[PDB]
Symmetry: C2
Subunit: 205 residues, 2 copies
């Protein structure tokens, strides 16, 4: 069974960028529900119930048709949010090989940011914006609802290894920014954990 | 060009069920944006610009590829919300031919409510729940994002004439109910405008 992972910091650790109230609800309510629903579906699937969540979402096709969707949505939700919590932190700075790779594939850090913001703002409805690594090259893509590029193009419409991502479901920014998703996206640059992003870039898996 | 319709009641006319703050933001910000983007996309196409919004969304395949998605999302958003505002009102009661048709196709009003609640609660991500008239029978269906059953099954995955609908995008209930969409859905029964619903059922078009 999966369990709600504890945050790598306190609920108010991202103030004044991300509000304390949302962090709490987003974690203890939204993420908790994904964990609970994923467990309920896995009770009758012992073979898959033991796989790490990041691995299970790469094998959605091997699941019985009546379970494919519920797990895509909930296991996907669990995987995405787990990665999201670890990708947030104040006080880090973009540098090293990651910074070099970004300037190489996007021209500059500013071009990259503009590209990411555009993808995040243009995702209509619920979804995520990602910075992924594919073919030794970095790219910006977005997915719908709780889909992840780890699921493959056939399923999510995107592919690649997630380096970092931004949750653009309205629950992630409505209490503080309401309809102003653009302001939320800009505030994100202040809390993106570049150390974790660099770490994932180094691992490549 | 489309004009943002004014509400048929005060922004707090639905209290204590739907909060005043949300009604205002939902109307003046979210709906306003859909109208703005729909009008901008129609600036160059005079043919379709003259058509009522309800008609335009039934002819999406007759639009140039580059204009199809932007209008599907925004003209759809304009049509859905316009219908939504008119479908809300306190103090009405289900009765007459509509009440009869509901008991006929669902067994009872309670079965209908349960079916509607299920569709509204199970719509993952952003979307709408609808009570549609498919020929001579009533049915409950849901669509994603700003799709409308008026767009046809090929596009929205559903079809039929909308009698009434519920917006389940998180912005419609997050300020007051946060993650508790089920409480929001229950509260909806107190503000559904049955008179307007009955009127639409009578017109059938
Ligand atoms: Mn989320
Ligand atoms: Mn809405």
């Amino acid at each position: 069974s999966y369990t709600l992972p504890s945050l790598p910091y306190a609920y108010d650790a991202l103030e004044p960028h991300f509000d304390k109230q949302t962090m709490e609800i987003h974690h203890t309510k939204h993420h908790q529900t994904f964990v609970n629903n994923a467990n309920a579906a896995l009770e009758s699937l012992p073979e898959f119930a033991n796989l790490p969540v990041e691995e299970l979402i790469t094998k959605l096709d091997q699941l019985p048709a009546d379970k494919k969707t519920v797990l895509r949505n909930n296991a996907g939700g669990h995987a995405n949010h787990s990665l999201f919590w670890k990708g947030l932190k104040k006080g880090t700075t973009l540098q090293g090989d990651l910074k070099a790779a970004i300037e190489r594939d996007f021209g500059s850090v500013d071009n990259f940011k503009a590209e990411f913001e555009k993808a995040a703002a243009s995702r209509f409805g619920s979804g995520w914006a990602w910075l992924v690594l594919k073919g030794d090259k970095l790219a910006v893509v977005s997915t719908a609802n709780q889909d992840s590029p780890l699921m493959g193009e056939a399923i999510s419409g995107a592919s690649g290894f997630p380096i970092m991502g931004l949750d653009v479901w309205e629950h992630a920014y409505y209490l503080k920014f309401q309809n102003r998703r653009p302001d939320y996206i800009k505030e994100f640059w202040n809390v993106v954990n570049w150390d974790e992003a660099a770490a994932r870039f180094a691992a490549k898996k």
